[PDB]
A paper describes a structure:
[name] catalyzes the reaction between long chain fatty acyl-CoA and intracellular cholesterol to form the more hydrophobic cholesteryl ester, which is then stored in lipid droplets within the cell or transported in secreted lipoprotein particles to other tissues that need cholesterol. Previous studies have shown that [name] is an ER-localized multi-transmembrane protein that is evolutionary conserved from yeast to humans. [name] is the founding member of the membrane-bound O-acyltransferase (MBOAT) enzyme family, which transfers the acyl chain onto various substrates, including lipids, peptides and small proteins. Each hSOAT1 subunit is composed of nine transmembrane helices, which is consistent with previous prediction based on the biochemical data.
To overcome the conformational heterogeneity in the tetrameric hSOAT1 sample, the functional dimer construct (hSOAT1 66–550) was expressed and purified. The protein was reconstituted into the nanodisc in the presence of inhibitor CI-976. Subsequent 3D reconstruction generated a 3.5 Å cryo-EM map, which allowed the model to be built de novo. A strong extra non-protein density was found in the central cavity and the size and shape of the density matched that of the inhibitor CI-976, which was included during cryo-EM sample preparation. The large trimethoxyphenyl head of CI-976 is sandwiched between the catalytic residue H460 on M7, and residues N421 as well as W420 on the αD-αE loop, all of which are crucial for the catalytic activity of hSOAT1. The head of CI-976 also interact with Y416 and Y417 on αD. In accordance with our assignment of CI-976, mutations of CI-976 interaction residues, N421A, H460A and H460N greatly diminished the enhancement effect of CI-976 on the thermostability of hSOAT1 dimer. The binding position of CI-976, right in the catalytic center, suggests that it inhibits the enzyme by precluding the loading of substrate into the catalytic center. This is consistent with the competitive behavior of CI-976.
Residue numbers in the entry:
A (entry chain A), B (entry chain B): 118 to 488, 497 to 531, 539 to 548
Amino acid sequence: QGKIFIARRSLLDELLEVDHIRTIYHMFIALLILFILSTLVVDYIDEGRLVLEFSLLSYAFGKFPTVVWTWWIMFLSTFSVPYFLFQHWATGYSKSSHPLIRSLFHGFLFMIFQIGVLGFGPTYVVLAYTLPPASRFIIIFEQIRFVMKAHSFVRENVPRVLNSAKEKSSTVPIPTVNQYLYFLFAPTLIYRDSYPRNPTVRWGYVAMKFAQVFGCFFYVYYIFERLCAPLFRNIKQEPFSARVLVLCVFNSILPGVLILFLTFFAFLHCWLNAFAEMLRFGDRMFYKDWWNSTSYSNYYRTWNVVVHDWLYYYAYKDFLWFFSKRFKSAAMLAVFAVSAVVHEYALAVCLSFFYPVLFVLFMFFGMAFNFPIWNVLMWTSLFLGNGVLLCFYSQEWYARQHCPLKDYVRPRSWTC
Amino acid sequence: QGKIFIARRSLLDELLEVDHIRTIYHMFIALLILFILSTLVVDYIDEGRLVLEFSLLSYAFGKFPTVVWTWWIMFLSTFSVPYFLFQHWATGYSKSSHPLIRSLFHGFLFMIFQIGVLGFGPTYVVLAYTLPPASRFIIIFEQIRFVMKAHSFVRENVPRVLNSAKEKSSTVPIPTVNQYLYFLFAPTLIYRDSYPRNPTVRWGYVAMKFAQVFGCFFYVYYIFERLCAPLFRNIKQEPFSARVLVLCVFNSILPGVLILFLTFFAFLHCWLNAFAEMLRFGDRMFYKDWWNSTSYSNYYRTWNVVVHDWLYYYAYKDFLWFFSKRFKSAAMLAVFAVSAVVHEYALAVCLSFFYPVLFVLFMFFGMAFNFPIWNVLMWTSLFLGNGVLLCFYSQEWYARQHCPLKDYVRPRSWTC
Ligand SMILES: CC(C)CCC[C@@H](C)[C@H]1CC[C@H]2[C@@H]3CC=C4C[C@@H](O)CC[C@]4(C)[C@H]3CC[C@]12C
Ligand SMILES: CC(C)CCC[C@@H](C)[C@H]1CC[C@H]2[C@@H]3CC=C4C[C@@H](O)CC[C@]4(C)[C@H]3CC[C@]12C
Ligand SMILES: CCCCCCCCCCC(C)(C)C(=O)Nc1c(OC)cc(OC)cc1OC
Ligand SMILES: CCCCCCCCCCC(C)(C)C(=O)Nc1c(OC)cc(OC)cc1OC
């Protein structure tokens, strides 16, 4: 019915000790060194001198004070008002006569809080202040994580209070402020927080892995520059040939697959692991081997098991017993769908589109491969889907960048 | 003083059972499936129908009857006349009075045999019949292997006869015809042949790995087509910009590194292993982990340990005690040098050049990195060297293909 946190170490950290995968990692970072050397040489050729401009990151992270102010107000809101609302509701529930009306009132209050304060704020800051595209993504990912963990907090703390008031003890098991402040930075996503912990904080370890994140970000940056610039920077003498389109979906796979592997590694492994060992909770793995995945169910099961666990437990179970319809084969097909749309939302704000190639891509993916060789099929479909989504998104982004076309129903499909 | 053949299995065959490297292999073959699908789609777009032309292999393997006739005469020569010459020399040596003059006579006879019959034949077939470029490579690699194994045969069988005639026994330990015919197809390169053997012949195994070779060859083919065509097919509106050159040496690394990895795998692992288990001698590994290589000595030590063992034993030891000079630090720097030149020769015949970028590349490599982070330096230098050699060779090949310029001292360096 619940989840057990066991203190096993991260999978990739245990696996990276073997010398072969060690050499794969060294090959990756040698490729990065080659990238930076090629970039410095190209800059020294083009400008003659004065290397290391770093222009794309300056354009993508422009209004950074606005972003950090938005994050400050976001964090203080999601830290203060849900806790205070739950305190008031628990007191008014356990104190006096029939609180079912009061319970529905507080439930509406929390619903409007989450919806208003955590959609309107984060979404309308973007649509009002006209942020850079990458600076929208950080705050929208933050709002998604915050609403997920707030819903987790409430859904975990409701039934305990319910059963304790049914037992009718004045000692209401309300959570404290410090453990909530801890969970707000926890790498997990369920309010049953890191009661299993780590003994000490290896500061060399956290420094190494945080610098690893800081390096992987520049690896993403150099990948974007050296591959997404030559393939996409306004080669728009429109042939509309299927040859050019298939060559884009071919040539964008290497940047696509490198970005996917690298961002998996960076974000999950070292980002979370830095905020794990810095927070004394490195006591849970957050991804099994997603390459060892023949069927689709397993692939979703062990890619970013944080999101998978949150979605599975809360969405699957609660949203399932709420319906228990005659067609329960969609028990996953439903949640993935909204997952799709939330990813669509994640690509709706920062891209200023709604072009749902990820949505229909996921639908074709699932409805085609739900009905060892399966591992090869999974890898080839992953390459092709990654490549097509990357080429389509970059192509539409630069085609709308070509002409502003001043409701965005499928724009820039014609080369402007 | 000698070598011991132990029946340990191939390294990569034992390592490929682990599921992670298994997934790397499946990723590779899924990439190949994506390659062939992209090629069929591009052909169906360009021609409208009538897929699967296979033109480049028809041009590269044109005069195949001539190649197989050359190989037949090569094999029958190197199978008959060295054996007969050694028989006659051993008999005339152990039979009668002072054979030092006769021994020098037979030594000159074998020297002229190897030099004439195994340079002139194979090299002058090429320079007379004007073979396709890839069909030169098969016969020149065959002549190199044949001269190496013939020299091995003679250098192993001389001292045994010497010591046996010093002991003065009429039973001269001459080798038989069948074991020589076996060694001529043996995967090893030392005449101390596969006395350790395998019990049986797994025909499913040899069929699978031979089909694996046949697939890896097409993987090389599709790599060449989809990457070396767009980057190199006569984009010759000469800027002579350092930017275009560094972008070539950058963009040719992925085809370069894929070709190197794949050809290592294909040729060594499955080619040799098919001719190992089909010949009842899979009782020796022929490469350790060359990725786990920090220093240069180890890298050369365990890349294609067949050639390394032949060179090391015969060249190193014999050519070393023949000089034992005051500067013996070149004990490796010498042999590698001739190795370089033989590779240069391997790239002198089939490329119709002598452009020695591999030679000076190897020299800079060694003289710069002889004096974990070393693993990264090795990988980045390997990427850069592979890329520069591939771009230079393809560029010069296509630039000489542009205009024939009808002694080839550094041609096509100007864009024709
Ligand atoms: C059918 C054809 C395409 C198969 C091609 C197989 C090639 C791509 C694969 C199969 C097994 C692989 C090797 C297995 C493990 C390692 C250890 C790592 O530290 C470096 C890469 C290296 C050395 C791999 C390189 C590429 C490799 C040799
Ligand atoms: C400093 C930055 C560049 C490091 C980037 C590290 C990335 C490229 C590396 C480090 C460890 C690697 C993983 C280790 C082993 C495997 C198992 C194999 O079956 C699939 C690839 C996979 C999943 C690797 C993918 C790429 C990987 C995650
Ligand atoms: C830009 C080229 C494509 C790169 C792909 C990865 C980009 C960073 C994604 C980061 C994020 C959002 C956390 C994530 O992993 N996404 C994700 C997931 O977790 C919510 C679950 C999931 O189900 C199997 C599939 C998912 O992506 C398909
Ligand atoms: C075309 C792009 C570059 C691809 C590189 C591999 C091509 C096939 C080579 C096949 C062959 C000749 C057998 C070989 O492995 N060469 C080789 C070697 O053995 C003799 C020893 C050696 O010393 C460390 C270095 C060697 O190559 C640098």
